[PDB]
Structure formats: C-alpha cells, structure tokens
Amino acid sequence: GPRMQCSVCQWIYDPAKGEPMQDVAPGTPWSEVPDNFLCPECSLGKDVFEELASEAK
Ligand SMILES: [Zn+2]
Secondary structure, eight states: OOOOEEEETTHHHHHHOOBBTTTTTTSSSSSSOOOTTBBBBBBBSSSSBOOOOSSOO
C-alpha cells in the first residue's frame, strides 16, 4: 500500500483511499490509472508524478 504525491500542490495518493469516485478505485496501479486522471488540486499531466501505488507484496 504505497502512496504518491504531486510536487505542485502536495496531494498524497493513498491507494487505500484513492478517488474511487473518479474512475479510480482504491488499490489501483498508478499504471492502470488512466492518464485521464488529473490532480483535483493541480491536475498534472501525470508527468510531475512519481512514487508508487497499489498495495502488493
Ligand atoms: Zn496535486
């Protein structure tokens, strides 16, 4: 259960919470996360995004 963050607004993405109400349910691979996804605070082209996501191992 990793978590990412945007180096713009500073929004942490916890797969344990995610934005299931945005076409992205918890426990989702950042990879699967459709580029359509845009930080609700600093959208972002998913380019300024890093870290990990989705719970595993
Ligand atoms: Zn953000």
